[PDB]
Amino acid sequence: GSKTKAPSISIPHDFRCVSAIIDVDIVPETHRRVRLCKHGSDKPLGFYIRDGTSVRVTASGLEKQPGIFISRLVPGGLAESTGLLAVNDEVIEVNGIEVAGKTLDQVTDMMVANSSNLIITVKPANQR
Numbered sequence: 001g002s003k004t005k006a007p008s009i010s011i012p013h014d015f016r017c018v019s020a021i022i023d024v025d026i027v028p029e030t031h032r033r034v035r036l037c038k039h040g041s042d043k044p045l046g047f048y049i050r051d052g053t054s055v056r057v058t059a060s061g062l063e064k065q066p067g068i069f070i071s072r073l074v075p076g077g078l079a080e081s082t083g084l085l086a087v088n089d090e091v092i093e094v095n096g097i098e099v100a101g102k103t104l105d106q107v108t109d110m111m112v113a114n115s116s117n118l119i120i121t122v123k124p125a126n127q128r
Contacts, residue, residue: 006096011117019078022119031092034084036118045111046077047085049104054090068099068107070122085120088128093121
């Protein structure tokens with residue numbers, strides 16, 4: 001079941017953007033959220049994604065999941081500039097859509113869809 005904690009962010013026509021870590025007061029340090037904001041026109045997100053298998057730790061032990069990892073960040077890109085996000089980090093949620101079961105096609109498409117107000121939730125890999 002999908003139980004995401006996604007704030008219903010209503011975006012106004014505001015012309016100043018900063019990628020900020022939202023839900024930081026609620027979400028554990030195990031997850032990192034940056035909100036992507038549009039600047040002028042819809043330029044592509046400053047991160048690329050790849051697929052693989054991520055290790056999810058539970059009380060049951062080490063379990064493997066189909067994971068979507070960041071492949072690389074665009075130099076001078078929002079995530080790269082903030083230093084709040086790294087290339088190794090795997091994405092957990094996008095806007096509230098969990099990337100579990102989603103393809104890169106679907107996830108990229110989903111992210112570009114909510115390009116105006118997009119919550120990117122990754123979990124820090126602490127560099128793999």
